[model samples]
Target: VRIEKDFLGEKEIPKDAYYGVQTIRATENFPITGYRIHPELIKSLGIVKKSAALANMEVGLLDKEVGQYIVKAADEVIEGKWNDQFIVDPIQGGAGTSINMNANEVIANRALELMGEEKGNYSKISPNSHVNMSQSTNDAFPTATHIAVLSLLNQLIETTKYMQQEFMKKADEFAGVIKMGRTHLQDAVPILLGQEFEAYARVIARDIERIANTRNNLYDINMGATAVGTGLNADPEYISIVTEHLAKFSGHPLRSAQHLVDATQNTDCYTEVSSALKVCMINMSKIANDLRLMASGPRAGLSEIVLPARQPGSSIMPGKVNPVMPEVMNQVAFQVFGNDLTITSASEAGQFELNVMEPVLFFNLIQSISIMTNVFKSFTENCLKGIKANEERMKEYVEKSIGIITAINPHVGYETAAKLAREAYLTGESIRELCIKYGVLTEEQLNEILNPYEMIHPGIAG
Candidate 1:
């Protein structure tokens, strides 16, 4: 290991180790964001590794004495003593060997800490030689990825369901106000604000069902299937025991899948889950964009709904309550979009029998799920859930829109009603007033044609 004298003055990792410059440079470059992969995802690693060890234990492949040391060390690793070491090089290559090394160092070092010894202490109790024995990077990283994906989806399901509940509440709150519905950014008809909110809720509910159904692909565990899907050096019974243990930990009843080759070889499953996530993100993005536009201006733009003010929106523009929360959610959605791209690229880059793209798959999927989880929760709790309905603004837009043309449906035919609405807009008068002026309907008849109060009945105003 040649150290770059210009930078660290010496090799960061010790000599005789398997990892090299690519891994070291990656660590040096991508400094920790103080943020980690979501705990839901990261916890899956502990479950996988422990379950793998238990499988080996049950199979009699793990030495009784040495296995105890390895299991104990792994327990500390699960407790997060060496989480800093879990950081992998951000590069997307080598079948995630760098990540395997990171986990190796963390588990080995953590176990070392529990004992009186320091790091680099290897004999019978080394991370690779002992703890990671009977496994290859092929098995460990993929199994961990499977568990991480399942756990993340579990959280995503919960988050979206909770958000749907909040939307239901808002649906009731805004039921009294009538708003103009647009088909192509042009006024079309009247719709209660509650119906709009309810539509959003329904879409989310449907998306949650889709997400739950797709998570089954991720529940297939790949723990005992060693390099090349042969389980060459692995104990015979390790497969079932490890999978069952992990299933117990995850509460998902996972098992050794028949298609180990496909599990480790192709990354389509990651793409499948990430694609589901993208669909959900699209819905979330649509909602945020809707809220931002509706609350675009207090004066200059369409102020149909006023967003809850969080902070001064601009640095120079005082008294400006920017749609920061929605903006934040928008940016989060954009990040999820980028994450989806990363997942796609990595998924495509996999080779014949194995993808050298696990690092990118895990990191990108973790980010997508984490950001989405946070964005969904924040958007509801901080922004939409507590938003005060602007009934006056909503009513003003409804009353001004040509949608009131429908109110004259009984008195006039479709053509006359359309003409009246268009003429009223041109003349800057109410459709009822236009009817009275044009003598299409008499005063009493015009009153019968237009009723703004009932039109906006959905919104209870002060």
Candidate 2:
């Protein structure tokens, strides 16, 4: 009664039924903590599925009649169908043996249907021989990671470039607007808003270069290094032809790993990709800090700039608005950082010849890439694209800062400038008024010396 199979409701699934079915059932019944691979893992698995099929076709391990039929069936899985197959019966052991078996059964069943046969028929189309031919989950899982990470790199490059472009547009738009800069949340001096915008643009531009530089690490694959690199049941010519076929299928000239053993044992490529994403997250976090401070308070805080209010930030405080976009970006940055940790730990725990932790490694890696890209796009459109500088607000703060008096220090001497700045602050008098009282400089000389534009350069105006 566990599964009422309509017509086969009372028919027993023989006590000798394969372990895969038992595993599928047991896993479902238990509902354990580390129960299954994360969802984003499907994307990486898709890459593996496609690569393996192409490689098999090229190596002649897959017969034209059966191979093409399996490929057609696999298409359904990679294009994101066959979701029900991933549900394991809570009892499976051997780490991901159930997952591998599931793939085999699903693909086998699909291929059998293609040949007008029923499922689980080891004769007409065996899951192992016809569907999984020349492959092990060991080889299949890692191969999927290589394909998925490479695909993510392609996407990151595009999105990062687009962000850079958006920043460049801000640089142009804000070029002439003078504003006070801050160091450690203290008002420092004045500079063109364009320069600050240019700095953001430069951060992502450098990230683009970093991603481009790390491109080679993701291209090495070990599709033929079956079952711990011994190529146990694989053909002699298997690796090369499969690699060639995969390159054609992926549309990238992927190369075989220099040593098949190295490929099977190493997950450092995951670390490499995660490191690149970490750099991206660093910039994203910096932007979050800046925007949060800018939008701090309409009155009590800096009030330097106004941010677009995307949502009503306060639940009880009716008039309160929050910087929702930057907050979301901050959460995403934290997640990316956490995913990097997952990758690093998984990579380090990998043993001499193989790491069973690939499920965690590739799963988090793909998740990081997918979510990062989506957040970056939303940030660009919802926040960056529509951001408006508080021009009059900048003018107000620029005139209030004590650091603005530093421009006059060179002309008036530091002691006199310091004394006048203190006087201005205590008495609520303008620096202009204090200058006249202290006899530090004439009205005309003070006017020329206090120009905020020239102070932003290498030194204050002479």
> Candidate 2 overall Cα lDDT vs. reference?
0.71
Give me the runs in candidate 1 sitting further than 4 Å from their true place: 1-42, 113-118, 313-319, 414-419, 435-462
C-alpha lDDT score of every prediction, in listed order: 0.71, 0.71
- The count of residue-pair clashes in candidate 2 stands at 10
Give the poorly placed runs of model 2, Cα more than 4 Å off. Answer: 1-26, 29-47, 50-59, 88-96, 313-319, 413-416, 433-448, 459-461
Give candidate 1's TM-score: 0.86
Writing each residue's lDDT as its tens digit, candidate 2 over 1-462 gives 122122323333333232235334535544655444443344445445555666677777677777776777777767666655555532234434556666666676667777786555657767767666787777776676576567777887898789889989988988767788888866787887878889989988998888766768878888878878878777767667767766775655588888888888987777988898888889988988888787777766656556777886677774455778889989988998998998899789888888877666766787788888888888888888877887788776666667778777778777787787887788777777677876877988876666655656686346
Checking candidate 2 for backbone clashes, the offending pairs are 24-89, 25-89, 26-89, 26-90, 26-91, 27-89, 27-90, 27-91, 28-89, 28-90
lDDT of 1 by residue, 1-462 (tens): 323222545555644343334346556655554334445444556666677666777777667665665567666556664454555554435666666666665555555545655555556456666667778889888887787777777887898899998998888888766777788888776678888898899998988988888888877767777888877766666676677788887778576778777776877778888888888878878888888888877778767787777785678775467787888988887887889998899888878778887676778888787778887888788888767767787666666667777655546877777778877778778665677677777887565334444553443221
